Amino acid sequence: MLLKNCRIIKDNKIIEGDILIDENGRIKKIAKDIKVDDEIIDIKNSLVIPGVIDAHVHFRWGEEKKEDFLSGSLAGINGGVCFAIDMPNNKPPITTKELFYKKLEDCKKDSKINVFLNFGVTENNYLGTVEDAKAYKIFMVKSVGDLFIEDYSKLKDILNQNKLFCIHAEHKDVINENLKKYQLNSWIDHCKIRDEKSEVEAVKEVIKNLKIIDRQSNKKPHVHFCHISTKEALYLIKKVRQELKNIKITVEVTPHHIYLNKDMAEELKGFGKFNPPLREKDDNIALIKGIVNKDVDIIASDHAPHLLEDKLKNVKNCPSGIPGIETIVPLTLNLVNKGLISLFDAIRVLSKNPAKIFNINNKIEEGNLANLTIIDLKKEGKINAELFKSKAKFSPFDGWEVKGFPIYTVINGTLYEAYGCKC
Ligand SMILES: [Zn+2]
Ligand SMILES: [Zn+2]
Ligand SMILES: [Zn+2]
Ligand SMILES: [Zn+2]
Ligand SMILES: [Zn+2]
Ligand SMILES: [Zn+2]
Ligand SMILES: [Zn+2]
Ligand SMILES: [Zn+2]
Ligand SMILES: [Zn+2]
Ligand SMILES: [Zn+2]
Ligand SMILES: [Zn+2]
């Protein structure tokens, strides 16, 4: 198959050319005006970027009414996402090697995009190695089962390893304190119970332990902070990066923590309830500036589908989490069109930095498997949750008019239509 009239992001620049994909799905040739006897698809000078990686999804293994590998990967295709990294807080949680490989087999059977699995860290399993895991996920607060580090004094031992750790950083003790101070009456109370200090104190807890390791140890962990949402945590991470010599720290943010704030809590209801919760407009701004200043490394969705039925309950009964794999690319491109980040910033946080951090080769280079996101940068259109392929057909962004959509998703050489090629 020949994709003609592409504008390709290769290295630091936009080149015009055609992309020839052989029938093994590998890029065979990149050159202007290629002339071959093959199937030809005219890209009409749309932008071709290395396939987008969503480094933070929950595809709900064990809870397949919420989402499964098929609906999740169809959602990914629809969102222009070529690679997704799925978290281990399943029913049961992925805390043993056998559970990991039993989930990996189900994943291989029906996933239509490139899905990788993270391993769940407990106080009991933390020295184990799982060769096919992309990263080791630490929850500092209750998720499911024993997937929860309840004793923070063990964090130094857990982190003192040559491993890639992802961390959900909210402080259990701050949240417990706040639960004695506030009642969950309305949606804003969720934001007061899991307040900004609960995130900042969890980040401080981790950093304190990394400083010890950096000087007293030969181990070189890479620590990736999931969904950072506060200006103070970003500041602390910026500071400590200047002090650490052996330990790399990366930062991810979500679209909802960039766009939404707690003044919207009562209007968003269940669709605004997620962990960490809605913050202040000043935090939105800090995260956007953090992308421009390269303090924020990646954007990931924290795609967390639940049943619509449960998301319509009151604040006490409503589960935390929203779907987001189908809105992450348009919401990020929308920032480009509003002049808040540059096009190359968008590429860096959706495609290039996730590929470096998690060791995923999505490069548009001859000989590589073709994993491409093809976008129409200027297409204006409404987000319409009825057009989602996820089982979770709802969103706080439903009805938003944004500019910039994926139109095609290429998965290992196979061309699919994305959300924008029906918009
Ligand atoms: Zn072909
Ligand atoms: Zn022929
Ligand atoms: Zn299904
Ligand atoms: Zn999380
Ligand atoms: Zn690393
Ligand atoms: Zn310090
Ligand atoms: Zn704030
Ligand atoms: Zn998550
Ligand atoms: Zn229910
Ligand atoms: Zn119910
Ligand atoms: Zn308009």
PDB file of C-alpha atoms in Angstrom, residues 76-204:
ATOM      1  CA  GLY A  76      -7.922   3.595  20.393  1.00  0.00           C
ATOM      2  CA  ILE A  77      -8.162   3.314  16.602  1.00  0.00           C
ATOM      3  CA  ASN A  78     -11.011   5.837  16.645  1.00  0.00           C
ATOM      4  CA  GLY A  79      -8.856   8.176  18.730  1.00  0.00           C
ATOM      5  CA  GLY A  80      -5.779   7.856  16.513  1.00  0.00           C
ATOM      6  CA  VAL A  81      -3.917   5.910  19.215  1.00  0.00           C
ATOM      7  CA  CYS A  82      -1.543   3.204  17.954  1.00  0.00           C
ATOM      8  CA  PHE A  83      -0.132   2.041  21.308  1.00  0.00           C
ATOM      9  CA  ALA A  84      -1.709   1.880  24.755  1.00  0.00           C
ATOM     10  CA  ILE A  85      -0.266   0.847  28.134  1.00  0.00           C
ATOM     11  CA  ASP A  86      -2.854  -0.850  30.333  1.00  0.00           C
ATOM     12  CA  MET A  87      -2.790  -0.620  34.141  1.00  0.00           C
ATOM     13  CA  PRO A  88      -2.886  -3.625  36.520  1.00  0.00           C
ATOM     14  CA  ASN A  89      -5.794  -2.628  38.816  1.00  0.00           C
ATOM     15  CA  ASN A  90      -8.064  -5.358  37.488  1.00  0.00           C
ATOM     16  CA  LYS A  91     -10.443  -7.880  39.112  1.00  0.00           C
ATOM     17  CA  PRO A  92      -8.266  -9.641  40.228  1.00  0.00           C
ATOM     18  CA  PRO A  93      -5.318  -7.214  40.213  1.00  0.00           C
ATOM     19  CA  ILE A  94      -2.209  -8.129  38.237  1.00  0.00           C
ATOM     20  CA  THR A  95       0.140  -8.949  41.129  1.00  0.00           C
ATOM     21  CA  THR A  96       1.447 -12.394  40.109  1.00  0.00           C
ATOM     22  CA  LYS A  97       3.332 -13.587  37.055  1.00  0.00           C
ATOM     23  CA  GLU A  98       0.598 -16.104  36.221  1.00  0.00           C
ATOM     24  CA  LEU A  99      -2.181 -13.498  36.372  1.00  0.00           C
ATOM     25  CA  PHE A 100      -0.030 -11.273  34.146  1.00  0.00           C
ATOM     26  CA  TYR A 101       0.368 -13.917  31.450  1.00  0.00           C
ATOM     27  CA  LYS A 102      -3.269 -14.990  31.664  1.00  0.00           C
ATOM     28  CA  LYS A 103      -4.238 -11.346  30.997  1.00  0.00           C
ATOM     29  CA  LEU A 104      -1.567 -11.051  28.290  1.00  0.00           C
ATOM     30  CA  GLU A 105      -3.121 -14.023  26.447  1.00  0.00           C
ATOM     31  CA  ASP A 106      -6.606 -12.493  26.523  1.00  0.00           C
ATOM     32  CA  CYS A 107      -5.041  -9.242  25.326  1.00  0.00           C
ATOM     33  CA  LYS A 108      -3.302 -10.927  22.354  1.00  0.00           C
ATOM     34  CA  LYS A 109      -6.568 -12.638  21.316  1.00  0.00           C
ATOM     35  CA  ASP A 110      -8.643  -9.513  20.657  1.00  0.00           C
ATOM     36  CA  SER A 111      -6.621  -6.305  20.863  1.00  0.00           C
ATOM     37  CA  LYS A 112      -6.586  -4.446  17.521  1.00  0.00           C
ATOM     38  CA  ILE A 113      -3.912  -1.929  18.564  1.00  0.00           C
ATOM     39  CA  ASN A 114      -0.499  -2.426  20.184  1.00  0.00           C
ATOM     40  CA  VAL A 115      -1.250  -2.908  23.884  1.00  0.00           C
ATOM     41  CA  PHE A 116       1.385  -3.341  26.584  1.00  0.00           C
ATOM     42  CA  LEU A 117       0.722  -4.337  30.177  1.00  0.00           C
ATOM     43  CA  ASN A 118       2.064  -2.901  33.405  1.00  0.00           C
ATOM     44  CA  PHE A 119       2.664  -5.015  36.502  1.00  0.00           C
ATOM     45  CA  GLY A 120       1.087  -4.248  39.875  1.00  0.00           C
ATOM     46  CA  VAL A 121       3.472  -3.656  42.792  1.00  0.00           C
ATOM     47  CA  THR A 122       2.511  -4.860  46.281  1.00  0.00           C
ATOM     48  CA  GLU A 123       4.393  -4.933  49.563  1.00  0.00           C
ATOM     49  CA  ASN A 124       4.882  -8.685  48.941  1.00  0.00           C
ATOM     50  CA  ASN A 125       5.916  -8.963  45.273  1.00  0.00           C
ATOM     51  CA  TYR A 126       8.062  -5.889  44.738  1.00  0.00           C
ATOM     52  CA  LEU A 127      11.396  -7.630  44.109  1.00  0.00           C
ATOM     53  CA  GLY A 128       9.926  -9.822  41.359  1.00  0.00           C
ATOM     54  CA  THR A 129      10.647  -9.151  37.697  1.00  0.00           C
ATOM     55  CA  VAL A 130       8.163  -9.676  34.863  1.00  0.00           C
ATOM     56  CA  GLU A 131      10.070  -9.582  31.590  1.00  0.00           C
ATOM     57  CA  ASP A 132       7.172  -8.456  29.369  1.00  0.00           C
ATOM     58  CA  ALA A 133       5.884  -5.729  31.695  1.00  0.00           C
ATOM     59  CA  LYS A 134       6.485  -2.209  30.446  1.00  0.00           C
ATOM     60  CA  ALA A 135       6.476  -0.636  33.910  1.00  0.00           C
ATOM     61  CA  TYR A 136       5.679  -1.359  37.528  1.00  0.00           C
ATOM     62  CA  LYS A 137       2.665   0.495  38.882  1.00  0.00           C
ATOM     63  CA  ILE A 138       2.573   1.753  42.455  1.00  0.00           C
ATOM     64  CA  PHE A 139      -0.701   2.956  44.026  1.00  0.00           C
ATOM     65  CA  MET A 140      -0.180   5.079  47.168  1.00  0.00           C
ATOM     66  CA  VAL A 141      -3.946   4.851  47.856  1.00  0.00           C
ATOM     67  CA  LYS A 142      -6.444   1.997  47.730  1.00  0.00           C
ATOM     68  CA  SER A 143      -7.331   0.726  44.267  1.00  0.00           C
ATOM     69  CA  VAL A 144      -8.300  -2.985  44.251  1.00  0.00           C
ATOM     70  CA  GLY A 145      -7.168  -5.968  46.314  1.00  0.00           C
ATOM     71  CA  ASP A 146      -3.680  -5.654  47.787  1.00  0.00           C
ATOM     72  CA  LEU A 147      -2.703  -3.246  44.943  1.00  0.00           C
ATOM     73  CA  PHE A 148      -1.925  -0.470  47.388  1.00  0.00           C
ATOM     74  CA  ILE A 149       1.261   0.365  49.284  1.00  0.00           C
ATOM     75  CA  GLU A 150      -0.204   0.934  52.742  1.00  0.00           C
ATOM     76  CA  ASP A 151       3.152   1.254  54.547  1.00  0.00           C
ATOM     77  CA  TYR A 152       5.098   4.190  53.092  1.00  0.00           C
ATOM     78  CA  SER A 153       8.200   3.214  55.085  1.00  0.00           C
ATOM     79  CA  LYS A 154       8.728   0.440  52.527  1.00  0.00           C
ATOM     80  CA  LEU A 155       8.915   2.918  49.615  1.00  0.00           C
ATOM     81  CA  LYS A 156      12.700   3.211  49.848  1.00  0.00           C
ATOM     82  CA  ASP A 157      13.078  -0.570  49.467  1.00  0.00           C
ATOM     83  CA  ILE A 158      10.487  -0.777  46.679  1.00  0.00           C
ATOM     84  CA  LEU A 159      12.036   2.056  44.644  1.00  0.00           C
ATOM     85  CA  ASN A 160      15.647   0.883  45.146  1.00  0.00           C
ATOM     86  CA  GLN A 161      15.703  -1.135  41.907  1.00  0.00           C
ATOM     87  CA  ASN A 162      16.684  -0.746  38.248  1.00  0.00           C
ATOM     88  CA  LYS A 163      13.065  -0.547  37.157  1.00  0.00           C
ATOM     89  CA  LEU A 164      10.621   1.827  35.495  1.00  0.00           C
ATOM     90  CA  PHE A 165       8.014   2.729  38.118  1.00  0.00           C
ATOM     91  CA  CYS A 166       4.733   4.520  37.460  1.00  0.00           C
ATOM     92  CA  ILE A 167       3.171   6.067  40.562  1.00  0.00           C
ATOM     93  CA  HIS A 168      -0.354   7.137  41.412  1.00  0.00           C
ATOM     94  CA  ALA A 169       0.597   9.770  44.003  1.00  0.00           C
ATOM     95  CA  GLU A 170      -2.114  10.672  46.480  1.00  0.00           C
ATOM     96  CA  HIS A 171      -1.350  10.554  50.198  1.00  0.00           C
ATOM     97  CA  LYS A 172      -3.540   8.096  52.132  1.00  0.00           C
ATOM     98  CA  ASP A 173      -3.023   9.878  55.469  1.00  0.00           C
ATOM     99  CA  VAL A 174      -4.004  13.336  54.189  1.00  0.00           C
ATOM    100  CA  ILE A 175      -7.155  11.872  52.627  1.00  0.00           C
ATOM    101  CA  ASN A 176      -8.068  10.049  55.875  1.00  0.00           C
ATOM    102  CA  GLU A 177      -7.537  13.259  57.873  1.00  0.00           C
ATOM    103  CA  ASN A 178      -9.804  15.146  55.455  1.00  0.00           C
ATOM    104  CA  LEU A 179     -12.471  12.425  55.620  1.00  0.00           C
ATOM    105  CA  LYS A 180     -12.902  13.284  59.305  1.00  0.00           C
ATOM    106  CA  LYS A 181     -13.232  16.994  58.455  1.00  0.00           C
ATOM    107  CA  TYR A 182     -15.636  17.063  55.475  1.00  0.00           C
ATOM    108  CA  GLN A 183     -18.757  15.172  54.463  1.00  0.00           C
ATOM    109  CA  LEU A 184     -19.335  14.031  50.862  1.00  0.00           C
ATOM    110  CA  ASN A 185     -22.499  16.029  50.188  1.00  0.00           C
ATOM    111  CA  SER A 186     -21.890  17.366  46.678  1.00  0.00           C
ATOM    112  CA  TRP A 187     -19.352  17.122  43.865  1.00  0.00           C
ATOM    113  CA  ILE A 188     -17.054  19.873  45.178  1.00  0.00           C
ATOM    114  CA  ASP A 189     -16.502  17.869  48.379  1.00  0.00           C
ATOM    115  CA  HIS A 190     -14.607  15.241  46.400  1.00  0.00           C
ATOM    116  CA  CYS A 191     -12.160  18.033  45.479  1.00  0.00           C
ATOM    117  CA  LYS A 192     -11.813  19.045  49.148  1.00  0.00           C
ATOM    118  CA  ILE A 193     -11.252  15.529  50.481  1.00  0.00           C
ATOM    119  CA  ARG A 194      -8.596  14.602  47.909  1.00  0.00           C
ATOM    120  CA  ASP A 195      -7.174  18.092  48.047  1.00  0.00           C
ATOM    121  CA  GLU A 196      -4.042  19.501  46.417  1.00  0.00           C
ATOM    122  CA  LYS A 197      -2.018  18.830  49.564  1.00  0.00           C
ATOM    123  CA  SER A 198      -2.912  15.116  49.337  1.00  0.00           C
ATOM    124  CA  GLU A 199      -1.135  15.024  45.961  1.00  0.00           C
ATOM    125  CA  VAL A 200       1.773  17.253  46.999  1.00  0.00           C
ATOM    126  CA  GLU A 201       2.492  15.228  50.169  1.00  0.00           C
ATOM    127  CA  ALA A 202       2.514  11.954  48.198  1.00  0.00           C
ATOM    128  CA  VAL A 203       4.994  13.442  45.709  1.00  0.00           C
ATOM    129  CA  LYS A 204       7.155  14.706  48.619  1.00  0.00           C
TER     130      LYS A 204
END
